[PDB]
Write a protein that binds this ligand. Structure first.
Ligand code: HEM
Length: 152
């Protein structure tokens, strides 16, 4: 990614930082709406029946915030995130068993929510930059997955 692309990424990310809990719950609800098979991975969401019950569950809100916290830390490294990605690939490949396609799904949800809340700060060029950052994240995770013997 160019420095200009990183700056567009970190510019919209600063808007997520103004309300992490809120962005977090929206992204998870969008993920589950769009790709209900993913809900199975979340023991603290999967028995909840409505958006409103999810938005009100402290423990369902938790992976929403966890995701954004970790992804925030990774994006701020602007590509130099081996120390953050190694452990994330370890857990998601060997314990949680998250296929790369589920990482595409969550990327789609992030993009959707950012555009929904911040259309003024998230036009074509910013969406392009964010897509590149998340593609890089997925490409790097994927290679770590294979190193660990997970072909997901
Ligand atoms: C944006 C990409 C993602 C990031 C940055 C991310 C980050 C994290 C982090 C930091 C944790 C806690 C520590 C760990 O176990 O490694 C975690 C846990 C977990 N993640 Fe992810 N994750 C992502 C995508 C996903 C997806 C797509 C799923 C499944 C649909 C998933 C399922 C889980 C599960 C089941 C846990 C354990 C429960 C929990 O601690 O919340 N993750 N994730």
């Amino acid at each position: 990614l160019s420095e200009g692309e990183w700056q567009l990424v970190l510019h919209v990310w600063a808007k997520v930082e103004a309300d992490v809990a809120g962005h977090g719950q929206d992204i998870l609800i969008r993920l589950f709406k769009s790709h209900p098979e993913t809900l199975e991975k979340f023991d603290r969401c999967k028995h909840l029946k409505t958006e409103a019950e999810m938005k009100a569950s402290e423990d369902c809100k938790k992976h929403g915030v966890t995701v954004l916290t970790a992804l925030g830390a990774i994006l701020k490294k602007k590509g130099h995130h081996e120390a953050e990605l190694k452990p994330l690939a370890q857990s998601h490949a060997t314990k949680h068993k998250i296929p790369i396609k589920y990482l595409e799904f969550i990327s789609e949800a992030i993009i959707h929510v950012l555009h929904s809340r911040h259309p003024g700060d998230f036009g074509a060029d910013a969406q392009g930059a964010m897509n590149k950052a998340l593609e890089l994240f997925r490409k790097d995770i994927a290679a770590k997955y294979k190193e660990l013997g997970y072909q997901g």
